Design a protein around this ligand. Structure first.
Ligand SMILES: Cc1cc2nc3c(=O)[nH]c(=O)nc-3n(C[C@H](O)[C@H](O)[C@H](O)COP(=O)(O)OP(=O)(O)OC[C@H]3O[C@@H](n4cnc5c(N)ncnc54)[C@H](O)[C@@H]3O)c2cc1C
Ligand SMILES: Cc1cc2nc3c(=O)[nH]c(=O)nc-3n(C[C@H](O)[C@H](O)[C@H](O)COP(=O)(O)OP(=O)(O)OC[C@H]3O[C@@H](n4cnc5c(N)ncnc54)[C@H](O)[C@@H]3O)c2cc1C
Ligand SMILES: Cc1cc2nc3c(=O)[nH]c(=O)nc-3n(C[C@H](O)[C@H](O)[C@H](O)COP(=O)(O)OP(=O)(O)OC[C@H]3O[C@@H](n4cnc5c(N)ncnc54)[C@H](O)[C@@H]3O)c2cc1C
Ligand SMILES: Cc1cc2nc3c(=O)[nH]c(=O)nc-3n(C[C@H](O)[C@H](O)[C@H](O)COP(=O)(O)OP(=O)(O)OC[C@H]3O[C@@H](n4cnc5c(N)ncnc54)[C@H](O)[C@@H]3O)c2cc1C
Ligand SMILES: [Cl-]
Ligand SMILES: [Cl-]
Lengths: 383, 383, 383, 383
């Protein structure tokens, strides 16, 4: 048992933190105010290494493990206020780069993977539908096999990066049943006939991270664009969620570390009744809760990633981490606001915007109720 | 013991609800989107009766008790999405109209009170300072007595309605000590030399309800503009907070009643896994919490107002109501968002904006930690 | 709307409180220490009126409504430390006296009801089985119709008062289906051939309130011992639970009122660090929670009972009250213990025994998860 | 970073677990029922190694680090139902053996330490007084220096093991001020003139772990019985609490691991409504909370002990662990009871007794409010 980072891991974290502070956080307030996702800045961050993860050197990646990748993303979360951009970049990595690397043919990787790893192409992951969110195997988009490939029809919604993506990793039914083997994955390029990408739909949470719906009207998918085997898509989707749920969630751990530091500084500096407000137990009790949450969920995250790196079954640990991080991030957001009082209603300081940005952490990649269904199944309660 | 409204009270509630739906809620989405406070619409609502409260018929009021006034404001909260406007109107009523009615001289009431009651003049309440929020008796603005009145200097912050107000109810020190008798209240008109009203400072919560800072640079206050006796201001401020804390908080009870209805409708209609999502206990358990909260805090509010109407000491009951309503409003906001999942990130439906609008309820008129200090004192724990 | 008791209700409460303090609470510590249920003392309390409730004067009752009955039981809970005895007496009233009064034939009432009302006979309610607790319609005891009545077989468990009861109100299947109409109710006397009443089974919660299992080995039930019509038993059981869940739960409201007074007195008197421990916000924040809980659940209880008295549908209100009272009673038990620190480990003061006595409130008459299923159904979430 | 135990640590844990199951847990139910602390069995466990900890081989110890010692005690907590005995043995180790080893003179260690390490003498730690619990530096017992040593007077309360102890580690004032340097520690033998050990005072929590008060009436303490330097006692007390708070708290982590296994087995086996009760989300959501708590507080405990072993400052980490473990142990106790329903009221299964045994974990060695004061001070909020 050892609770230190390796020297390599300390360097990865500190380098990522410096990049997030010195490059991404510069001029963040203007981009946030204007709801701008700068794709030039996104591509710099991708190329710096935030789009690399476990990808091999052959395709321009860094062969990072899960703990290394989570540490990099934790630094990003602590160092940059522009969490919309960071969420966009990490969704591309965890839900698009990594599945293509893990399941795509040599031909598909040779054509697209280095471009996705190095900041040349942006990808979006398209699985959720109007009638298939938590119940993702109810998806109704169909990739009907035909001569030469598939005919694709359907509608996908809530698709992060769709308005800016060059390629789409799309999940659709290649068989009528709701089984583990009815879903397949495909890579489709922007501009393919019949791919209709909707306009950006604004939101108040992660408000500069673009999403939209996409509609497939009789798209022809060439056989060679299928990712993995026929029917693998349920398993490919599942695997990609595991990566997203652990590593991507590290963003909110780093965000909580930044929030706690900001909150402690204010509670020491702001005086009422002749003393720092942190001297009143109502105030310090909440801040202590924020610190307890941060230490607990960080350790759970690190252990989940470490278990994956060891080749152990980490499915329940990752679901537990996802759940704790997101619940703790939202509640600590509210606790920080309450520490600042009326001063929390300053848009520049951004405490309310920070809370808005944490609200979706309990929803993306599977809600926290679905995390508990996963844990319940692993505990043997769904027999 | 009786838990029915009177017929008079049912009529007051239903008339207020119809006005909020048929007048104020029309075109609310455009005003919300554009961050517009329509003063023409505000004045219609004031004149309809939302600026009347307990004021006598002599000054154009309706002689409502606290329970009647709270019921009217509950209807406003349920019926209109434009809670920024409603908060603006109720702050004018509870913190400006009512103290002037209760403490001002016949001369001051004759000059200003009917105008404030009937939608002709807008008022702002100015007590909080940079170094005096919870510790309001630390306020440093000084009204130094002189020949003919007072010389006023100081700075007030977080002042609801200041950018649109015609008159300001201002609290300042007329004596150096932090005692119950060091503070006095004054009415000052917009345009008085030395009154410098700051520009609107935007916020994400209650985002169309304007606030700003105001600065006093050697304002001369004529003696006849003092509200109540010299030193009454601590007691006048306290009394106005009691009215604000009970009646004004009813807005968030009505808002919770609307939110619960919206949430129940969705949980019955949205299906996943072959059934309505309300059939899963994770989902229904949260909605039941929202319903438990609504019923409990509504009863506590009604009893607090009823006690006031009976002439009983309601101070602790009002602090308890303020605390429960605001905590429950925020947590139910988060519960509704979690019920809708990704669909909660629709700006038109407004579930995230609703949460933003509830966040300040735990802060205005005294934070919830200060409510617990008040209750602790009434329980004998501050002896 | 009115939050005062009537003069009649104030007298009922104060008379019950005096009886609980001056008769039942005397020598309670010895009976508690020795795990004694004094049936002589029980019968005095029954005859005083705690076994009367809504029963008509014809059978020696007081024709109390639900709110009156709940107030009497609240006083009992506040005034007597011997909550095991009080629970025993209220179970007899709410689950045995009242169903017999509401559903039994003139012949059955004439034979047994005045004796049960006036402290002459003790009754036990026997519905729960090893395979039928929350799922009460799965009960497997069978009352097979035959010439002259029924042949009864089965086993009932968790039966309050069975070791001391003279008569048993028993629920059993008269038809094979799990429907609303498969269950019937019967009154059976102690000593009937084939009625095998088990020995008292000790417990640490409500430890002097006796319970045991009972077994039916081919009991012959005469036709005239059926309570209500054939198949009414599901509805009779349901109705009796409504009475038990509202009125009987008042015991724990009165117990919380006593606990809060004890806790406030200690927090004012116990000094550390040069002041009363109630002056520290960690301490006063918990006590304030106890007070918030007490006021909220008392109002919910009173409204539920008042709605019943008005002839309105009170089913959801009663389930909400049951849930709030019991959750609040347990958590306030823990909060009081934490206020006293090591001093809470005094058996005479009884703070730990009080917590033990509250633990079963979340279980009897339907667990709190079943209360939420009931509320969910009334909210339309079980369609 | 590594989350595996070493092979040595796995052996320590498994050996301790086997001893707790195969020796201490045998016949535990009889001892629990009879409120028996078997000193013969206690001494076997001490000699097995539970009284060794970090003590050197010179005095018969095992030179364990904090993580090793915490693992041994975690196994004890999981393997033996007789947590009263385990608490007694661990209090002797952490608050008496370890301070004597760390601070006592060669002469005092040579005379007493091997006997305490090996199961020959039992010790009690006596610091708390009627007016000095959380405010331990208010203690009023005085050790007035005189020719040859000290004259001791005072009263100590809540003293674990006092009715069975052969020696007492006693803290008293050697100087009038409440400073870090006013308190000294002394070892006093049973039977010393003027040492009046009270009779066992029963309690419902940890009910077979004996405690009592002790009174000093003009005891003469020889100079050579002082432990450490004059005035070290504040620092010796503090150090002993650090050991007690981390390692001793591991008992409740192991107890939670056992409780969760018992609870999962029941939730899989008990059926209602045609399925295992674990299939209902109200039920599985609570069990998942128990599992989340166990994993989080175990990791926090291990890291606190590891930090100590690394020579790092672990004071805040230990206070956080103490707080989380004890809060989680109590709440999981209530969650297990609610999972079992009426079946939790079985004394043999012991779910209610388990809860009683966890209640004091939030109080011993400093309440959880004092843990938050410690963390607040380490966070810089008490400047
Ligand atoms: C910021 C963000 C980015 C996203 N990016 C993408 C993307 O890039 N690609 C993509 O394909 N999708 C994306 N999604 C969609 C996300 O996958 C869905 O929002 C998620 O699967 C939940 O589905 P839903 O929103 O339809 O909620 P629903 O499934 O309708 O859930 C509604 C409520 O019902 C509860 N519920 C549903 N089923 C159960 C059950 N069995 N048991 C208990 N409770 C249940 C839910 O927990 C929730 O409380 C994104 C979502 C967000 C918030
Ligand atoms: C929507 C809104 C509208 C407002 N409108 C007006 C207006 O119209 N006129 C006007 O004069 N003011 C107005 N205010 C200001 C409001 O009165 C102050 O925000 C409030 O008094 C709290 O003061 P503060 O913001 O400086 O917080 P602070 O007092 O700095 O509180 C910061 C934190 O310290 C805690 N704290 C402070 N003292 C204690 C203590 N003794 N014990 C425990 N905790 C403590 C607080 O609870 C809070 O968590 C408005 C505020 C809001 C949010
Ligand atoms: C003090 C006390 C006195 C009692 N007196 C009597 C008496 O006099 N007469 C009599 O007949 N009975 C009596 N009972 C029994 C009581 O009725 C049962 O304990 C109660 O019905 C719960 O059943 P159970 O204990 O078998 O729990 P179970 O039904 O086994 O419940 C176990 C767990 O599963 C949960 N669960 C079960 N079904 C669901 C579901 N659909 N959804 C979500 N969660 C679920 C439960 O909430 C609980 O958490 C008494 C019980 C107590 C504690
Ligand atoms: C099982 C058990 C075994 C024990 N064994 C020993 C032993 O062997 N030797 C020995 O010397 N002692 C022993 N103790 C005593 C223990 O040290 C004291 O119980 C503990 O120090 C708390 O003191 P107290 O009980 O007087 O509570 P108090 O100090 O009176 O606390 C009462 C309440 O006030 C709160 N409070 C007090 N001060 C503050 C503050 N500044 N800020 C916020 N809240 C505050 C407390 O948190 C608590 O909620 C034992 C206690 C227990 C439960
Ligand atoms: Cl405090
Ligand atoms: Cl469910």
């Amino acid at each position: 048992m050892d609770f230190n980072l390796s020297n390599s891991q300390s360097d990865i974290y500190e380098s990522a933190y410096r990049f997030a502070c010195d490059v991404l956080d510069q001029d963040a307030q203007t981009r946030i105010s204007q709801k701008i996702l700068s794709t030039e800045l996104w591509k710099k961050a991708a190329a710096y290494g935030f789009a690399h993860g476990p990808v091999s050197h052959q395709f321009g990646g860094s062969e990072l493990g899960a703990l290394d990748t989570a540490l990099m993303i934790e630094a990003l979360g602590k160092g940059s206020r522009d969490i919309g951009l960071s969420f966009s970049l990490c969704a591309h990595l965890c839900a698009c780069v990594i599945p293509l690397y893990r399941f795509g043919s040599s031909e598909l990787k040779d054509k697209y993977l280095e471009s996705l790893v190095t900041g040349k192409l942006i990808a979006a992951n398209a699985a959720t539908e109007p009638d298939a969110g938590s119940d993702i195997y109810n998806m109704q988009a169909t990739a009907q096999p035909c001569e030469g490939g598939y005919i694709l029809n359907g509608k996908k919604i809530f698709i992060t990066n769709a308005p800016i993506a060059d390629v789409f990793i799309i999940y659709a039914k290649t068989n009528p049943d709701h089984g583990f083997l009815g879903v397949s994955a495909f890579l489709i390029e922007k501009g393919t006939p019949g791919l209709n990408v909707g306009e950006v739909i604004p939101k108040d949470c992660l408000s500069n991270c673009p999403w939209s719906e996409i509609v497939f009207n009789d798209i022809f998918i060439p056989q060679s664009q299928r990712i993995g085997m026929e029917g693998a898509g349920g398993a490919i989707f599942h695997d990609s969620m595991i990566w997203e749920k652990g590593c991507l969630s590290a963003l909110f751990v780093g965000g909580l570390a930044r929030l706690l530091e900001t909150t402690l500084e204010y509670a020491k500096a702001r005086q009422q009744f002749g003393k720092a407000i942190g001297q009143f137990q109502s105030v310090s009790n909440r801040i202590i809760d924020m610190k307890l949450r941060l230490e607990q969920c960080r350790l759970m995250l690190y252990r989940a990633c470490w278990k994956h790196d060891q080749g152990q079954d980490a499915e329940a640990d990752i679901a537990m981490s996802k759940l704790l991080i997101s619940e703790y991030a939202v509640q600590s957001g509210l606790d920080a606001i309450q520490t600042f009082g009326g001063a929390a209603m300053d848009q520049e300081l951004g405490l309310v915007r920070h809370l808005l940005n944490m609200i979706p952490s309990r929803i993306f990649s599977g809600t926290n109720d679905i995390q508990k269904e996963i844990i319940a199944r692993k505990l043997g309660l769904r027999g």
